[PDB]
């Protein structure tokens, strides 16, 4: 508990400067919700207050791109449902209560202009996971098929690089490696299923070779998604 409180204090002190928080959002964006989760699990009043204060500082108006960062945090890390639970939950720490209320207001403001497209962009930036938000159902994907491609596959070239990195990791047996091998191939199959023109760009960029290598050997999810890609 003492070590966690010290880490939270250090994170808050560093994050008091808006520039530091803005820079960290570009390298430790997942940590933004990780701190919130740690506070939610943490029962100590002071530690929770410090974590909520750090989270709010990350979303402080001074921090560059505060609105977009807050919206992304709410959409991805479930900071808005977490803030709703905190509002429902009760604690004796008045300072912690005020910090949690401020974080909840920030989350509500961020989610008032939120969309799953931000989560899709973040997932494409990660490219080291097994599943993605768009796999939930056929609703969002109906537009997402033409979202990453920018209607011409041009914007999807970043998705192409992400898939190339996931294929480079696919040759290894790491859990993240297999997850990425499956996820990139599944997204490629989903995108190719509609408007096959961009498939040529994927095909010229090694799409056929990538699909063959995913199902080459020593793979379970990689082949499991290469089957969809080649079907």
């Amino acid at each position: 508990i003492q070590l966690q409180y010290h880490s939270l204090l250090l994170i808050w002190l560093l994050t008091f400067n808006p520039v530091f928080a803005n820079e960290l959002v570009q390298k430790y964006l997942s940590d933004f919700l990780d701190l919130l989760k740690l506070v939610k699990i943490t029962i100590k009043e002071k530690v929770s207050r410090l974590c909520i204060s750090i989270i709010l500082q990350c979303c402080s108006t001074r921090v560059k791109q505060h609105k977009k960062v807050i919206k992304q945090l709410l959409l991805l890390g479930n900071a808005l449902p977490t803030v709703q639970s905190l509002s429902e939950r009760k604690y004796s720490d008045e300072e912690l209560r005020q910090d949690i209320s401020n974080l909840k207001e920030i989350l509500e403001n961020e989610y008032q202009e939120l969309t799953s497209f931000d989560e899709y962009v973040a997932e494409l930036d990660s490219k080291l996971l097994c599943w993605s938000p768009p796999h939930v159902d056929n609703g969002f994907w109906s537009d997402n098929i033409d979202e990453f491609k920018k209607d011409n596959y041009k914007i999807f070239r970043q998705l192409i690089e992400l898939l190339q990195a996931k294929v480079r990791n696919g040759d290894v047996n790491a859990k993240q490696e297999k997850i990425i091998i499956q996820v990139a191939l599944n997204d490629i199959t989903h995108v190719v299923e509609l408007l096959p023109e961009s498939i040529d760009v994927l095909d010229k960029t090694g799409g056929k070779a990538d699909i063959m290598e995913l199902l080459n050997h020593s793979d379970s999810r990689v082949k499991y998604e290469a089957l969809k890609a080649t079907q």
């Binding site: 159902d137 056929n138 609703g139 109906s142």
Partner: protein, 115 residues
């Protein structure tokens, strides 16, 4: 009268029973029966869209479509792209799946304008 038929795209629990007790299942001079069994995991999605076209555009006697959510979710693009008036496509819940008032085409249009 010009257009009177009822058409049902639903599992056996609905097309065979329930309304079928008073609605019937066959046309006066056709064997198509204006219905599709839609076997779970057996009927093709492409075949489902083909049947939707069959009962919405290929034959004129059908006055209403009454389609279960199971086909509708997979047939989302086709039913959303259909904008005519006569077949009056109507989505229904089936088995355990409820209405889900944020999915079907007509209510989507209604919320789109004006509320």
């Amino acid at each position: 009268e010009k257009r009177t038929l009822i058409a049902v795209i639903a599992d056996e629990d609905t097309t065979t029973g329930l309304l079928l007790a008073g609605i019937g299942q066959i046309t006066p001079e056709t064997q198509e029966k204006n219905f599709f069994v839609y076997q779970e995991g057996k009927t093709t999605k492409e075949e489902i869209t083909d049947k939707f076209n069959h009962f919405t555009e290929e034959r004129d006697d059908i006055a209403i479509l009454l389609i279960n959510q199971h086909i509708a979710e997979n047939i989302r693009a086709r039913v959303d792209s259909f904008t005519n008036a006569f077949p009056a496509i109507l989505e229904i819940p089936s088995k355990d799946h409820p209405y889900d008032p944020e999915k079907d085409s007509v209510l989507k249009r209604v919320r789109k304008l004006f509320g």
